[PDB]
């Protein structure tokens, strides 16, 4: 079982609606555990998971300080970016930051990242070697220069290869019952006669974790041409997903649904009957 920790940062200028918005969320695997909302009341980092709640005031004070520093940096960046692209301070703009790390099944460092975006487009990102940068355009070239001269890379690499990984592991034990769990999908099939010539077969997967899963439709034991809905959150820490096929009436038994998830000892095969 592989694992990961991610932080997603959103910075939004809003001319005529007050000061810039800043939001940070933290994930371990497919579970979120922390948040910060500059519009919220506490002005602190907040627990968004029961298992993180048992962290002491030392932890929360520290995280609050950092996220505030993060916020300030993005506040400055918003204006800087306006300058690089020659934009008036009337338009609304968004900055996005994402960093975190990956561990293999052995819980050892696999890979780390630091991706940065401006108005939904790539801006600058840390290469896999965690030693060099990729600038999306000429503007990001100037940032690339800055960051090289300031040795930002080695700073991040230290975090990504170490602290990030060590804390991912710590979280994994602290949230054993939650994070180190697999919830096998509950399945069932529903037949719905849409037209007189065609009916829809929908294959359901519910209450599964983690989110990874694959649903396939086969006719006579052969893969199919099919509506596959984006995996959605149930709101209780599990995920849902369904796959549907439009089949001619009477030929229902020709079709079989195939569900695979790491919570299952082996794949499931569902037929309408």
């Amino acid at each position: 079982g592989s694992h990961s920790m991610r932080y997603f940062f959103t910075s939004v200028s809003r001319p005529g609606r007050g000061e810039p918005r800043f939001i940070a969320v933290g994930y371990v695997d497919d579970t979120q555990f922390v948040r910060f909302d500059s519009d919220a009341a506490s002005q602190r980092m907040e627990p968004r998971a029961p298992w993180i709640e048992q962290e002491g005031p030392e932890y929360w004070d520290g995280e609050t300080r950092k996220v505030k520093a993060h916020s300030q940096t993005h506040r400055v960046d918003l204006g800087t970016l306006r300058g690089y692209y020659n934009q008036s301070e009337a338009g609304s703009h968004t900055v996005q930051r994402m960093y975190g790390c990956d561990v293999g099944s052995d819980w050892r460092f696999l890979r780390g990242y630091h991706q940065y975006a401006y108005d939904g487009k790539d801006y600058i990102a840390l290469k896999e070697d965690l030693r060099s940068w990729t600038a999306a355009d000429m503007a990001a070239q100037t940032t690339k220069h800055k960051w090289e001269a300031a040795h930002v890379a080695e700073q991040l690499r230290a975090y990504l290869e170490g602290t990030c990984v060590e804390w991912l592991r710590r979280y994994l034990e602290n949230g054993k019952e939650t994070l180190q769990r697999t919830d096998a999908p509950k399945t069932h099939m529903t037949h719905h006669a849409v037209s007189d010539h065609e009916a829809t077969l929908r294959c359901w997967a519910l209450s599964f974790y983690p989110a990874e899963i694959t649903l396939t439709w086969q006719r006579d034991g052969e893969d199919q041409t099919t509506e596959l809905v984006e995996t959605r959150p149930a709101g209780d820490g599990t995920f849902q997903k369904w796959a549907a096929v439009v089949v001619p009436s009477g030929q229902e038994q020709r079709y079989t649904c195939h569900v695979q998830h790491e919570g299952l000892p082996k794949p499931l095969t569902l037929r309408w009957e």
Binding site: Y59, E63, K66, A69, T73, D77, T80, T143, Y159, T163
Partner: peptide
Amino acid sequence: TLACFVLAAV
């Protein structure tokens, strides 16, 4: 935990 160091501006 978030990164500890101060983040360079763009």
